[PDB]
């Protein structure tokens, strides 16, 4: 949902209050990607165990 | 049973080695 995936482009392009919105969209999605990964590895660790 | 490993570590995905290496497994 962000304007770009590169954080350096956001800060060098958008205003300070607008850049925080675009960066926050990345922090939300990229975190859920980790929450999905750690969930699969945790369950997979129990299966292999 | 079977750079890629460097690209993952650059992204924060650290692949730690096992404690019990294959040589240690073979002697058990």
């Amino acid at each position: 949902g962000a304007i770009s995936s590169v954080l350096n482009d956001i800060l060098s392009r958008l205003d300070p209050p607008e850049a925080e919105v675009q960066i926050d969209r990345l922090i939300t999605g990229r975190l859920q990607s980790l929450q999905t990964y750690v969930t699969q590895q945790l369950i997979r660790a129990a299966e292999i165990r | 049973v079977t750079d890629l490993i460097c690209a993952q570590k650059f992204n924060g995905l650290t692949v730690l080695p096992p404690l019990l290496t294959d040589e240690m497994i073979a002697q058990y």
Binding site: S5, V6, N8, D9, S12 | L4, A7, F10, N11
Partner: protein, 48 residues
């Protein structure tokens, strides 16, 4: 080159070690990408 620096080519700024590349890019290509779709190589705009 051969040192960790803060580069800025065509406004694209970042951190990394610059060094002469062995890759032969076509006359039109400017930037490249790695497995992670992040910037792997660059083209200096003034002296190609």
């Amino acid at each position: 080159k051969n040192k960790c620096v803060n580069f800025n080519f065509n406004g694209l700024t970042g951190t990394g070690v610059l060094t002469e590349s062995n890759k032969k890019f076509l006359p039109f290509q400017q930037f490249g990408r790695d497995i992670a779709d992040t910037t792997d190589a660059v083209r200096d705009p003034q002296t190609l």
